[model samples]
Target chain A: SESQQLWDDVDDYFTTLLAPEDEALTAALRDSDAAGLPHINVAPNQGKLLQLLAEIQGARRILEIGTLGGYSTIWLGRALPRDGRLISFEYDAKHAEVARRNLARAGLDGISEVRVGPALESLPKLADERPEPFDLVFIDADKVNNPHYVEWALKLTRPGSLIVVDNVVRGGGVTDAGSTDPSVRGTRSALELIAEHPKLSGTAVQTVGSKGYDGFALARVLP
Target chain B: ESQQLWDDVDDYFTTLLAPEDEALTAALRDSDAAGLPVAPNQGKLLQLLAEIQGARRILEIGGGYSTIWLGRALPRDGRLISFEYDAKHAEVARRNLARAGLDGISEVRVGPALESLPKLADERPEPFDLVFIDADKVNNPHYVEWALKLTRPGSLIVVDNVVRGGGVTDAGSTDPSVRGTRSALELIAEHPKLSGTAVQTVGSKGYDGFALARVL
Candidate 1:
C-alpha cells in the first residue's frame, strides 16, 4: 500500500549506509515500527557489528536456519576464519539460489553452504552428531514454529555459542506489557524456555526497528 | 541552590547505572571534561555510590591516574585487577597509586583487554570477582561474554558505552544496535547482579543516553 511505498523509500536510505562488504550482509539496521508492522527482509546487521563478533571469536562454526538472499549469512559467515563454514537452510529454492549467488559474488560462497527444503525438517536432521558444534545459530525463517526450531538449535549448539532468533517481537506479538497476542505468546514460550532451561543460559533482547520495529528476540546460548 | 541541584542530578545518574566497576569509574575521569570545560569532579571515579553493596574485588580494564578512588574504595583485602592497553598509562597509574600510598591493593597490568582476560586469567590462580569492561566499544559483546563466563554467578559485570543513542537522540531509525540497546538494558534491567538496571539519560554534550544493568 502507501505505507509499503514509504517502507521502500526508508529501506533504501537505511541500507545505503552499509560499509563496503559483501552486498550479502544481514541488515536489521532499523527497528522502528516493529511492534505493529513487522518486516523481515529488513536489511543487514551493520558493518561495525563485525567489529563486535571479531572480539568474542568463541563459536567457529555457524548455522543459520534461514538464508534470506544471504543477508545475515554474509554477516555471520564473515566472522568465521577461512576454514570456518556457516551451514544455512532456506525453504524457498528461489531465495536460496539468490542467497547462493550473492554469497558467491561476495567471495563468501566457499564459507557458506545452503541446504534447500523446509527448515523444520532440516533442523531435526542437523540434531544428529554436532560436528565441531556451531558457535552461533540464527533462526529467522518461519515465525510460527519458532519454539520447535529453537529447540533443535539449542540441542546442537555447544556452550558459549549464541542463539539469535529474529522477529520475536513480531507485530506486537511480544508486547505483553501492553497485552499478549498469539505471536507474542508463541515467542515468549520460546524465550521462557531459554530463561528456564537449566543447561542453557540466555536473555531475550527487546528491540524496536531501525529497519522496522515491531521487535526481535536474541539470546546468547551460555556455554 | 539550583546549581547544587544540577550537580545532584549529575550525581543521581552517575550512580543510577552503578558506577562501581573499576574500569568505567576510572574512564569517566580520564575523559575528564575538567581539562577543557567538562566538570572537574565530572568523573565519578570510585564514588561511594548509593545502593552499592559490599564488593570485595574490582577489576578496571583501563588503568588511569584518576582511578585512585577505585583503588581506595576497595576493602583492605579487596583486590583491583586493572588492565591498560597503553604502557604509558599503566606506568602513570602505577606512579599515581604509589603516590597515593595505594599499593599492595591493586594490580595494574598492561595488555589488550581481550587478550588480557584469557592470558592473564590463564596465568593467575583465580578468576575475578568483578569484571569491568571500559575498554574499546567494539569489544563490548566479547567483553560481556567473557565477563559472564569468568565471574561466578552474582559477580558484577559492568559495560560502558552501549549508548550510541546519544548520537541519534531522536529514537528514530538511527542504528539497529542503538534501538536494540533499550532491549539490552531491559534484559538486564532487573538483575541478579543488583536486582535492577535503569538507564540514566544524562543531558550531556547535546544528547542523552543510559547505562543500565546489574549482573546477578
Candidate 2:
C-alpha cells in the first residue's frame, strides 16, 4: 500500500510536469466515467509515451485493438498528420458509441473511426478490405485474446511497423507458468510469439504508476 | 524487499525474450566488476528504440554495457560515438564492442563527456538520430543541452535513472543526482523545442525511471 501511494504520487508528478491533459482529454475521461466505463484507460504518462512512440515511428496510419472511450485513441491520433488515419475496434457497441463521441470531442473523429464488434470478428472484415498496412498497432483489448490480436496485427502491418501490447505484465503474474488464469496464458503466448516470430524483434518492460504494476510489450516488424 | 519480486520478474522476461549473447554476457560480466549496466530488458529497449528511430548516428554519454546494445542496433555504415569518463572503462567498453563485432561502427572516447561533447561538435559530424544520457547524474542537464545541439528534429534523447527511486519528487533534496535529474526533467518540460515524458520502471535494477524526449 505504501509503494502504491508512492507510485501514484510519482505518476501525479510526471503527469503534472510532462503529460498535462488538455480540456478535451480531461472531458474524455470525465464522460467515460459518467458513462460507467471501466477505469482501465492508460495513465496519462503512458498515453504520452504512446504518442511519442507514434511520432518516433513517423506513423501515417495506426490500428488500435481497443477503443476504451477513445482515451488512448486520442493520444495516438494526435501523433498523426491530417491525412493520416486510425481504425479502432471495440467489442461493445455501447463502448464504441461512447468512444465515437469522445473522438468527436477531441476533434479526432475526422482522422479516427471506432468500429463496433468483436475485434476477432472485425479483423476478418478488415482484412477483406485490403486496406493499407498500418504503421503502428496497439493491442489493448481482451487479455484472453492477446495472442490473437498480435496475430492480426502482424497480418495488417508491414515490415518496420511497431506493435505495442499493453497489460502484459498483469501485476507480474506472467511469470507463473502453471497459472489457470486465461489472461496470463494469453499474455504468455503473445510474448512467446513475439520472441520466436521470425519477423518480429521485441522486449517487455515492467512499469509502475497509478495503474499499478502492469507492463507492455513492444515489438518491431523486421524485413 | 519487494525488490526480490521485481528481480524475479525481470529475470523471467530476460530469459524468455531478451536473452544475451556471448559478447553481451561477457560485457555484463566484465562491467559488473567495473560499474553499472542497464538491465537486460532496458538494454533491449534501447536497441528497439534505436532501431525504431533508424538511427544512423548515435551519441552515448556513457560507454559500458549499453554501448554494446546500441551498437548492435546500428547499420553497418552507421556511427556510434561514446564518451567515457574513465579510460579503463572506455577500454573495457571498446573491447566489448569489438567482441560484439561492432568496433568498426562504434568508438569510445576516453574523457569526461562534458568536455568530449564540444569537441565532437567541432568535428562537424552529421546530427545524431538518437542520444542516450547515462553518465554522471550531476551533469545530466549539460549532457541534455549538448544532446539538443548535436541532434536534429525527430531525434530522440533518452536519459536513464531520472526517477532515482522517486527521489526526483523531492525538490529540497541535497543529493546532486536528484537535483541534476530534476533540472533535466524541468528543462525538457520547459524547452520549446523539446516534448517528452518519463515512466517509472521496476526490474533487476530497482525502482528508477527514464525520460524520453523528442527534438521538435
User: DockQ (Cα-based) per candidate?
Assistant: 0.05, 0.81
- Candidate 1, residue A28: the lDDT equals 22
TM-score of chain B of 2: 0.94
**Index of the highest-TM-score prediction:** 2
Candidate 2 lDDT, A1-223, residue by residue in tens: 8988898888888889999999989988888899999875357989999999999999999999989789999999999999999999999899899899989998998999888999989998999999999999999988888888889889999999999999888777899999899989999999999999999999999999988998889999998
First chain of model 1: TM-score? Answer: 0.76
Candidate 1 lDDT tens digits, A142-168:
666778877887787765566666665
lDDT of 2 by residue, B129-191 (tens): 999998789889989999998999989999998888888899899999989998999999999
Worst 10 residues of 1 chain B by lDDT: B198-207
lDDT of 2 at A206: 94
Candidate 2, superposed: residue stretches over 4 Å from native = B32-38
Candidate 1 CAPRI level: incorrect
Q: What is the CAPRI rating of model 2's predicted complex? A: high
